[PDB]
Design a protein around this ligand. Structure first.
Ligand SMILES: O=P(O)(O)OC[C@H]1O[C@H](O)[C@@H](O)[C@@H](O)[C@@H]1O
Ligand SMILES: [Zn+2]
Length: 455
């Protein structure tokens, strides 16, 4: 098996190339062996709506059963529905076969063993088990479980909308269309569907709400139908993107402000996690409401671990993964998050544009990406962490280097999904944004004067 598919947060490859049916079998065998080693024979399995789903899921399931595992096959479901299954069924282990927001031929595995989402050395440990033949052998079993209705009811029974809303829902032809439009209607909304037929060819736009290009159809429909809100889901339903009644894109760090207010109001002193890419305004906002702001590393699996370590009631990433523990289970779930957003907005007499515009705003950049190499990206960060001078500011090195200045901040870190450096800048003036950019530009050039600086 190729080493490149074993990534920091999960497993991901290209079907036909780096991820075959046989690889899926052996990955199943490794996960089943690790689950058993943690005392957990029961493993839930789900898949998204990708073309390669049926082929690879059978092999994944067989690998697990060949360890002696008891598999609960939940069929085709959103990622969070698989996480849900691993919280409410007998077993605390689960595997989701998904390639997330990537092009059609990509697939992969997001893995929970005995309650914990695997990352880093734990993901490599699976690859290492296969190489070593450190694998369990036994005769397992498979039971079909129809879990979607239970999930649907769980959310419906706990969300209380105070008024009706009209909402455009763009599924991007991903697996969210199996439930999101139906659930949102059941909450007391009317839903205008966009690309909600599940189709793994992704013939309209990629289900990647983090790019504004993939929200253009949603924004136009919101305006044309005079809708109260627009929602877009990524391919496997663990990410959500939001647009207001006037078409304004609400970035996830700003969504989190609304959610942090909600959660902290019922839970004084609650820990609230956000990643290094999120606005500093969120930090002040959480503290002002009496919560404890906890900045952490990018990556769904890393955020979920940090939530267990801190007891945080809510987490969010700039990528749109939002993780409710309060009233919920602590996993990232775009569908549940949409429902929580609708609950809050429905209790407000103002429109969604005005609810979000009331929070402070700064001037910010879109995520910047510089392509380096897979085998040099971490070394560039290490050199910055060793050598760099940032001027006066609060320096955080938990993920790359983030520096928080009086009037703004900057970040440079290595991506764990691509061979790139990722940067973000925010400040309260254009002048300050340029000052911080110049600091980072000069520090990168000090490490490697040939490095591109396309900001
Ligand atoms: O910045 P990175 O490391 O490339 O990851 C960015 C995003 O990738 C995926 O969408 C997920 O794993 C998210 O959890 C993460 O926020
Ligand atoms: Zn996703």
């Amino acid at each position: 098996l190729p080493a490149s598919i074993f990534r920091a947060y999960d497993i991901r490859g290209v079907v036909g190339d780096t991820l075959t049916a046989e690889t899926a079998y052996w990955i199943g065998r490794a996960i089943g062996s690790e689950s058993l080693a943690r005392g957990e024979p029961c493993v839930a399995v789900g898949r998204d709506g990708r073309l390669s789903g049926p082929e690879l899921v059978k092999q994944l399931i067989q690998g697990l059963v060949d360890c002696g595992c008891q598999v609960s096959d939940v069929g085709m479901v959103p990622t969070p529905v698989l996480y849900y299954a691993a919280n409410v069924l007998e077993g605390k282990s689960g595997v989701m076969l998904t390639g997330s927001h990537n092009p059609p031929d990509y697939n992969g595995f997001k893995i929970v063993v005995a309650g914990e989402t695997l990352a880093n050395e734990q993901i490599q440990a699976l690859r290492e088990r296969i190489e070593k033949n450190d694998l369990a052998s036994g005769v397992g079993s498979v039971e079909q479980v129809d879990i979607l209705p239970r999930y649907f009811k769980q959310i419906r029974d706990d969300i209380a909308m105070a008024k009706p809303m009209k909402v455009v829902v763009d599924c991007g032809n991903g697996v969210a269309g199996v439930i999101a439009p139906q659930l949102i209607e059941a909450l007391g909304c009317s839903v205008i569907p966009l690309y909600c037929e599940v189709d793994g060819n992704f013939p309209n736009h990629h289900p990647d709400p983090g790019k504004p290009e993939n929200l253009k159809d949603l924004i136009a429909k919101v305006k044309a139908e005079n809708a109260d809100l627009g929602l877009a889901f990524d391919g496997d339903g663990d990410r959500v993107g939001v647009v207001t009644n006037t078409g304004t894109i609400i970035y996830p760090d700003r969504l989190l402000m609304l959610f942090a207010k909600d959660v902290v109001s019922r839970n004084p002193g609650a820990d609230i996690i956000f990643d290094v890419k999120c606005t500093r305004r969120l930090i002040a906002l959480i503290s002002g409401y009496g919560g404890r702001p906890v900045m952490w590393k990018t990556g769904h699996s890393l955020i979920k671990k940090k939530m267990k370590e801190t007891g945080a009631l809510l987490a969010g990433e700039m990528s749109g993964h939002v993780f409710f523990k309060e009233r919920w289970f602590g996993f990232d779930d775009g569908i549940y998050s949409a429902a929580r957003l609708l609950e809050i907005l429905s209790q407000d007499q103002r429109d969604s544009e005005h609810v979000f515009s009331a929070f402070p705003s700064d001037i910010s950049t879109p995520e910047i990406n510089i392509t380096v190499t897979e085998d040099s990206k971490f070394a560039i960060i290490e050199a910055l962490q060793r050598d760099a001078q940032w001027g006066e500011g609060n320096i955080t090195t938990l993920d790359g280097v983030r520096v928080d200045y009086p009037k703004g901040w900057g970040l440079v870190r290595a991506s764990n999904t691509t061979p790139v450096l990722v940067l973000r800048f925010e400040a309260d003036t254009e002048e300050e944004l340029e000052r911080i950019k110049t600091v980072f530009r000069n520090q990168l050039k000090a490490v490697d004067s040939s490095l591109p600086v396309p900001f």
